[PDB]
Symmetry: D2
Amino acid sequence: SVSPVEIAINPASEITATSAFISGTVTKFEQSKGFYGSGCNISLLYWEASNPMHVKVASSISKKDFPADISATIKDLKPHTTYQFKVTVNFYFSSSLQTFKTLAL
Amino acid sequence: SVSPVEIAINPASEITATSAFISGTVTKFEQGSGCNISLLYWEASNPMHVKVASSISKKDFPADISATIKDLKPHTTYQFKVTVNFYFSSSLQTFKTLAL
Amino acid sequence: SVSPVEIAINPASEITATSAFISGTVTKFEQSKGFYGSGCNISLLYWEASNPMHVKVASSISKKDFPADISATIKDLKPHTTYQFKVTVNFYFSSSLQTFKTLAL
Amino acid sequence: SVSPVEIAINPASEITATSAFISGTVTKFEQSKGFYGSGCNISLLYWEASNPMHVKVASSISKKDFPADISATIKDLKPHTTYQFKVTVNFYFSSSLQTFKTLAL
């Protein structure tokens, strides 16, 4: 795309009653001196869909080469509960949201 | 649904070489104070230079927001989104202006 | 200064029961994806202190020459109510907060 | 107070050429009826002052009881380099910034 920053989000996999594997990719982060000159923080954030005001950080990394994947197995989830997650770049750019529901226990 | 806040973004319409009609809707905001709804846009090449097309407070939902944005460059890609309380964001929508 | 972005905030003035004059200055903004200084969004945002997520836009401007002042008279405030405000750049950088209380009458 | 969220930031201490102790406190976080016992994310973020777009997450925790402290010793810093940090709640509310410079030796 013509955008300098592109972020993809993947469907959750390995969904159990209390855990899931969530992931995304910063496909593009075009370098220029200054704000775009040192790579970026990539964070994978998740929350219970009913409470988007309490986020959890599954993973947070610094990268300077793209595409760059980010992933984590999140655990201790509530059974039979809807969760959402996203990838953020520099706590400014966001992927689209992805949603999944844990199994009943 | 289970989410307390939902936001829809609409495709741009009335796209010309230098303007477009952009809009979205806060379709759910569970609470009456209401919330701030802002309609933001930028040149896709420069996503850190945002412009505010409209910013309103509403307390009954669904609540729409819309604006005609003008003085755009021809044959140029823009994106826009709706944000609630500068916390929640819709998905991004993209359009490209016509050639002159 | 080391920092590429500097923002100052001024105390509210002209406080009435339902309005106030709020202002600040982006004293420095150094950034470009090319060889020439880029612009930024400068916004003055305010809220009732008791409801700090309901953030409203007093003014939003685009500038590329600094120092850059921003100001606004905010109206239709509630009497004898505490408000806060700040100046933001690109909805990412923030000044410190300022606080004031509207008059009773 | 009127404000439902209060965040205090402490000056950096124990500053060496390559480390510092950074800390703050969420002194008040008024929770809503429907989200009692839920909590919030508290994060301690730091960056080189010259590059405020690229932060590192020194600490990120969930808390539901307040006041709540957060701290980290940040390490492997660059000598004679200016850093800044802040405490953020739900990656939305922020303390004022603090700034310090590592020792040369």
